[model samples]
Target: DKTLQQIDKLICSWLKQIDNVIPQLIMEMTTTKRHRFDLVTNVDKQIQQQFQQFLATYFPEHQLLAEEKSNMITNEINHLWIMDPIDGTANLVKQQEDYCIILAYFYEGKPMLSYVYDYPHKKLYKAIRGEGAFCNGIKMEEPPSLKLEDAIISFNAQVMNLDTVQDLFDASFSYRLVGACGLDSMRVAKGQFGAHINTNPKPWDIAAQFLFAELLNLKMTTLDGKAIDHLKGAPFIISNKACHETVLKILNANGGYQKYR
Candidate 1:
């Protein structure tokens, strides 16, 4: 009962803090350095520290794995909170308009609850095991059956450096990159897109999105045709079942599959 109470308090506090800081963080990032297709700002560190302090204070026994600092998941605990304080740092730094605050709570190797805050829109996308996923309190349903040719997909172009995969990029109905894996995966969950592909993502980047994808009856796996190890960072692919295998086929044909290994 204490664990459940702590979880509830953590989630509520996190949402409230994130809501209050989103605008201020966005404004502060306007002048930060933009790094190779990504950026890390003072606000990122500030929010991360703020959340880390809260977590440490409330759940001192639990460990935290975050994107801004250490990347590995420790073996000392059964409960871990993975955080991506700012998911689309580059977009935010450039003031380009796409980013999210991602947080996930895992208990005994299973996701208990996840929150993806769309800062710009002031909307929260969340999921709790067995309870389905929701976007701003509205329940989300599984996407309708859609064919590959008709599907809108999201992928980062940075992974298509090789000629083989570059050639296959033209086959989709449309491909867009919003710079946030969580946001892209949420789009798949909401049926706005049929699939999302992140060629290289840290665990904190995808833990929450992966959970929502499962509840939506979508498939998620590493691009190498392997199961995802939540403790390790790797390429992650999420998609509606109708389009997942087809997407895999295209990737395998285009030499993208091996790169994920």
Candidate 2:
């Protein structure tokens, strides 16, 4: 409990500094030419290193895995931290509204505390594994168990199978592409959307989200419906109970994600 409280304070303090780094943004492309445009700006490295330094200095006992750097954990211990300096780099370069810094801490492979700071809107979404999920310190209610026909789903539209997409289209009321995994799922966790799916995601992209979804009693699993393994990327879905059951039923039966995912 004290540990989570300290983490909340650390994030709150760190967030105030986000605005100062926006003007320092300078887009630079990565080596990957995978047609999926990804850029890391000047602020990204600075913010990442800032937190990294803090963690090593103040909490050297904990393990860490960061997106801007390596995929490996620094320690073999139970306490682990994962961070994405900026979850929506493309949006950070363009609209700046959908980008956020995300972090998660796990004790013994179970989520303990997590955070998503929606920088542009100065909104903080947080969760304590056993306590409750919250927004800006206001406790959130359990999400409405919505059905497929009434649900709005967040689907990553950039990577797709034209064949299976119609099936997804058939499964929901509409679709959304927020260009950021953290924010995409945050919408679903906040009950604004019934579900969000990311076809390919690394530890940083999905790490913090697991805490929120699990704490809220929502389902989050691999595309074929299995528990997540942070060591690699996979297509995943986080959704309300009803919507999740309905989508999983269709996906398992029609082989929709089997072909695409």
lDDT of each: 0.77, 0.77
Model 2 weakest lDDT span, ten residues long? 26-35
- Shift of residue 238 alpha carbon in model 1, Å: 0.7
The positional error of residue 233 in candidate 1, measured at the CA in angstroms, is: 2.0
C-alpha TM-scores of all predictions: 0.88, 0.87
lDDT by residue for model 2 (19-104), tens: 67555453442222222456766667777888887778767777678865564553345778888888998887777578888888
lDDT of 1 at 95: 62
Tens-place lDDT per residue, model 1, 1-261, is 465546766777767866676667666654534345546787778888988788777777777888666635565558888898888877777764678889988888888888898878878898887677878779988889776678888886665555535544565677777778888888888878888888778888898876787788888898766788777868778987888877877776744544444
- What's the TM for model 1? 0.88
Best-fitting candidate, scored by TM-score: 1
Q: What C-alpha lDDT, on a 0 to 100 scale, does residue 92 get in candidate 1?
A: 73
